Structure 1
Amino acid sequence: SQKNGIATLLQAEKEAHEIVSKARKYRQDKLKQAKTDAAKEIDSYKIQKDKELKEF
């Protein structure tokens, strides 16, 4: 059980490290997404102002 037990440890540690990295990956990706989904809101509001500026 010497290398079976160590095998258990080694595999668990790879698996923990990867789940936590997946949540960290998720945070990077959401902050970039925030930067993206704010870029969309700006130019729909600007063209709204362009539309009623054209009425003048």
Structure 2
Amino acid sequence: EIVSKARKYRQDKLKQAKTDAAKEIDSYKIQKDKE
């Protein structure tokens, strides 16, 4: 159960990384559009 919980944690962190990177990506895109 502990391991499966750590795996769900892994997946969740895996989506969270993609979001917290996608926002800096769209802020670099928005910055590029602004410049």
User: Shared fold by TM > 0.5?
Assistant: yes
Matches within 5 A, 1:2-21: 18-21=1-4
- Distance in 1, matches of 2:29 and 2:7, equals 34
Q: Which runs of 5+ in 1 are unaligned?
A: 1-17, 51-56
Alignment root-mean-square deviation, CA: 1.1
Question: What percentage of aligned pairs have identical amino acids?
Answer: 100
Residues paired across the two proteins, number: 33
Contiguous gaps of at least 5 residues in structure 2: none
Q: For the pair shown, which has the larger CA radius of gyration, 1 or 2?
A: 1
